[PDB]
Design a protein around this ligand. Structure first.
Ligand SMILES: Nc1ncnc2c1ncn2[C@@H]1O[C@H](COP(=O)(O)OP(=O)(O)O)[C@@H](O)[C@H]1O
Ligand SMILES: [Mg+2]
Lengths: 254, 351, 54, 55, 147, 52
């Protein structure tokens, strides 16, 4: 599909069971072992599989291939042999913890340790504008997360930084098998990063969101066709979205 | 086969947070001396006499004494009958006095008798296996004389292939169904050892036992924040059971992060709002412990069996706050929530 | 006066309890790093000696 | 509290009253009136005294 | 099929103002959002029934085609519209009652407007009268003004 | 002034919400007729799926 101008996606589930099925073949063929009885060429096994993912240019067709490998650590130690081979080959990691899974954060993505080194050059113009401040807003919250357990004698800026960090977190939680659209995603983030939620109670942020999304699908369908097709969010759509979340927030609690 | 169900047992920790399933592979983890043989003796007590079809017990590499306390606790309960043709249990035994070439072909002999009932007949079969770590270990002893370089910490190079060659016959096909409970020894309390940490791919419901709970007196010591299931699903267990299970794990995990403050500050210097989420969590820890039936000679207490509809309704009321007027001791080793207040008054009068 | 005398000594006595807990946290980081290397070294010898005698 | 807890052994019979829940919230003038009122209407008619504190 | 439009459910239609009955008006907008998504779940036209492939793939004939002959010429009668008229009937009586403010208070507007005409007349000259100033500021019977 | 507009406020309020009650019940018959045409195809698709 990459050779013929099309696009593709591949998922290896999982690559940490290929290095084990290859170690057994080595030690039965009497090859010299190494660290944790892996052979000397387990780096050459995973490198020439992930380097086949490429973004071709227009003279060859314009195809692509995207690769998502899954790697299982043991007790959260990424400094093992195979969790350090595949980390240094690829671009960025998504680090799912087990502590956040039981504290209510589902999907339990830790955004403190997750990176991507293509950066913001793969986001659309609508998503890039709102999430650039959200990434800065959440990163200021994780500095002051250790003051939440006993904090009431702090500055009003610090009480504000805690107040936005909890409510931005509730927007990030998501049920299973419910994938959204980018035009619906940018609207929910726009409702939170502007300041339209600092008076709503932190337990109601989930109920407010499922109510607000079913509204704008049926009653504002002509605005979510001018962010899908436009790609960016203009000044005309900035005012048009502004009275929408003010109309819904006014009469909401019923 | 692809269909999923729920098989009710009667244990409060198991049915609430990690439900078992008909025709599904179940695992019992934990170290040495925490209760893997007793908890697998409990499911022959509850499940095997109310079951229609037959049952097979394969004992692989355990003490030869404990194969006699099964032959003498199954004659006096009438499951094995020595006088006619109405018995319901077969037994296959290769214990820890055998040569190590014979502790690695007994588990293949257990699931050969249990394959006859599923295939040549059509009945619903159970299968209990204890222990199954002694299938891996008994192949790591004959290995170096067969001419093989060792892998990581000392196991054979063909570790995850002959394990996966036995564990693909214990399945539910379109000709029958095999429920299977297995006890899995974890060596010196380390679930990152290569023998227990590759059985996880073959199990639907894992029940991780723990020595840090058992040394509190909470019995059965099942870790709630480490046990999973594939049917903890609000489309299968309903939306009322689902928001109760996650409501218990959220208040237990938030209780863990509060213990780091009490070590420096103290209990009394906390606020009144989180002096309540501790006291709600401590009543949830103690309410999970249930007096077993086959552990009467340890305890002297009686055997309780709480149904499924009562386990949810017991835990809604501790979370909502309908029992904030009782001390913690009123829930220790009780059955349903009705006996939690009858035990509360009987402690009061002796002041 | 007494609630100012007390609230300033809570500031100092919680400051030396984070210097002494960060002075202790570097000395256990070196011992963790000597012991992390010594286990990769030790279980590498057991594989080599197991293959050489075979 | 921590005055009474230290002196609970040697001088448990020379206490008059003890006032707890002090220092969580900031002190005010009403709490200086609650203490000084109960120092009078106790039944102990005294004639000198002294106060010790940390200036 | 058939589908008619509606008006704006923006300001008036959620502010019906009952006796503190904002909950009943909130439920009125909640039915319009639910039915519009249920109308967005299914289209106006259903799928088509291929008849020719039914004869060959289900070629055990007779029992297959007799159900396909009876279910083809069937009819689907929709539900009745008996409650559709009586709910629209009470709108005709209340709309005749809602103009009572436009009927009764219209004279109350002009009487207040005529009161602004005579109020200009009374003030007059500074030194005007001792009885024309005795309309706004009051007088009474014996022993009213205590102070 | 404030009681003149109080006349006109209730005559634009009432005619909006008395046609919302026309169209909130109008959608209730389309979605129960569209699901009547759809369901009669569903229970004849079961027989088109069974005998194969
Ligand atoms: N119902 C129970 N609850 C808690 N502990 C138990 C129970 N039954 C037995 N034990 C404890 O478990 C220990 C080991 O029992 P057993 O299950 O036979 O061994 P293992 O799990 O190591 O095979 C015993 O010392 C006993 O005190
Ligand atoms: Mg045992």
């Amino acid at each position: 599909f990459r050779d013929n101008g099309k696009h593709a996606l591949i998922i290896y589930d999982d690559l940490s069971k290929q290095a084990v099925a290859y170690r057994q073949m080595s030690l039965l063929l009497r090859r010299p072992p190494g660290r944790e009885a892996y052979p000397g060429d387990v780096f050459y096994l995973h490198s020439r599989l992930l380097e086949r993912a490429a973004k071709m240019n227009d003279a060859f067709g314009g195809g692509s291939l995207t690769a998502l490998p899954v790697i299982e650590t043991q007790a959260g130690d990424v400094s093992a042999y195979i969790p350090t081979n595949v980390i240094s080959i690829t671009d960025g990691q998504i680090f799912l913890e087990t502590e956040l899974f039981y504290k209510g954060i589902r999907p339990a993505i830790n955004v403190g340790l997750s990176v991507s080194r293509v950066g913001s050059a793969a986001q659309t113009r609508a998503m890039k504008q709102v999430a650039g401040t959200m990434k800065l807003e959440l990163a200021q919250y994780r500095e002051v997360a250790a003051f939440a357990q006993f904090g009431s004698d702090l500055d009003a800026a610090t009480q504000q930084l805690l107040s936005r960090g909890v409510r931005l977190t509730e927007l990030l939680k998501q049920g299973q098998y419910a994938p959204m659209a980018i035009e619906e995603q940018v609207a929910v983030i726009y409702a939170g990063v502007r300041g339209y939620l600092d008076k709503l109670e932190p337990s109601k942020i989930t109920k407010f969101e499922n109510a607000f999304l079913s509204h704008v699908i049926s009653q504002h369908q002509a605005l979510l066709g001018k962010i899908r097709a436009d790609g960016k969010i203009s000044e005309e759509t900035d005012a048009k979205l502004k009275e929408i979340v003010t109309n819904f927030l006014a009469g909401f609690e019923a | 086969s692809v269909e999923q169900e729920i098989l009710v047992t009667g244990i409060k920790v198991v049915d609430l947070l990690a439900p078992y399933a008909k025709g599904g592979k179940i695992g019992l983890f934990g170290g040495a001396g925490v209760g893997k043989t007793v908890l697998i003796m409990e499911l022959i007590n509850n499940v095997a006499k109310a079951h229609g079809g037959y049952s097979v017990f394969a004992g692989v590499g355990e003490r030869t004494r404990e194969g006699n306390d099964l032959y003498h606790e199954m004659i006096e309960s009438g499951v094995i009958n020595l006088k006619d043709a109405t018995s319901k249990v077969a037994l296959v035994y290769g214990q820890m006095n055998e040569p190590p070439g014979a502790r690695a072909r007994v588990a293949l002999t257990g699931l050969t008798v249990a394959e006859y009932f599923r295939d040549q007949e059509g009945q619903d079969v159970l299968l209990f296996i204890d222990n199954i770590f002694r299938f891996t270990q008994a192949g790591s002893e004959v290995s170096a004389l067969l001419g093989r370089i060792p892998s990581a910490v000392g196991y054979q190079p063909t570790l995850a292939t002959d394990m996966g060659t036995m564990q693909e016959r214990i399945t539910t096909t379109k000709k029958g169904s095999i429920t299977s409970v297995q006890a899995i020894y974890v060596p010196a309390d380390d679930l990152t050892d290569p023998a227990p940490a590759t059985t996880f791919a073959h199990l639907d419901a894992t029940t991780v036992l723990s020595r840090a709970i058992a040394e509190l007196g909470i019995y059965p010591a099942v870790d709630p924040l480490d046990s999973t299931s594939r049917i903890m699903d609000p489309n299968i267990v309903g939306s009322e059971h689902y928001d109760v299970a996650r409501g218990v794990q959220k208040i237990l995990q938030d209780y863990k992060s509060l213990q780091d403050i009490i070590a420096i500050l103290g209990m009394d210097e906390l606020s009144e709002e989180d002096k309540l989420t501790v006291s709600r969590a401590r009543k949830i820890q103690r309410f999970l412990s249930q007096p077993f039936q086959v552990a009467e000679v340890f305890t002297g207490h009686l055997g309780k069996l709480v149904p499924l509809k009562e386990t949810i309704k017991g835990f809604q009321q501790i979370l909502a706050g309908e029992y904030d007027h009782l001390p913690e001791q009123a829930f220790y080793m009780v059955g349903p929530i009705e006996e939690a207040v009858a035990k509360a008054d009987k402690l009061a009068e002796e002041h | 006066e007494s609630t100012t005398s007390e609230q300033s000594a809570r500031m100092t006595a919680m400051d030396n309890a984070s210097k002494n807990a960060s002075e202790m946290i570097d000395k256990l980081t070196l011992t963790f790093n000597r012991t992390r290397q010594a286990v990769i070294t030790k279980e590498l010898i057991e594989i080599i000696s197991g293959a050489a005698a075979l | 509290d921590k005055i009474r807890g230290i002196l609970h052994r040697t001088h448990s019979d020379q206490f008059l009253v003890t006032f707890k829940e002090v220092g969580r919230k900031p002190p005010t003038f009403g709490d200086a009136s609650v203490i000084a009122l109960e120092l009078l209407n106790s039944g102990y008619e005294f004639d000198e005294g002294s106060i010790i504190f940390n200036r | 099929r058939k589908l008619a439009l509606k008006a704006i459910d923006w300001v008036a239609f959620g502010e019906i103002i009952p006796r503190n009955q904002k909950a009943i008006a909130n439920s009125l907008k909640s039915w319009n959002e639910t039915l519009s998504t249920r109308l967005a779940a299914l289209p106006e036209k259903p799928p088509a029934i291929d008849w020719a492939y039914y004869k060959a793939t289900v070629a055990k004939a007779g029992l297959v085609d007799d159900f396909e002959k009876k279910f083809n010429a069937l009819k689907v009668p929709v539900p009745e519209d008996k409650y559709t008229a009586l709910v629209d009937a009470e709108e005709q009586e209340d709309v005749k009652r809602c103009a009572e403010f436009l009927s009764l208070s219209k004279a109350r507007i002009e009487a207040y407007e005529k009161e602004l005409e005579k109020m200009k007349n009374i003030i007059p000259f500074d030194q005007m009268t001792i009885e024309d100033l005795n309309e706004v500021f009051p007088e009474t019977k014996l022993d009213k003004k205590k102070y | 002034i404030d009681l003149e507009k109080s006349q006109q406020a209730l005559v634009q309020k009432r005619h909006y919400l008395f046609d919302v009650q026309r169209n909130n019940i109008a959608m209730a018959l389309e979605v129960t007729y569209r699901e009547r045409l759809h369901r009669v195809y569903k229970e004849i698709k079961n027989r088109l799926d069974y005998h194969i």
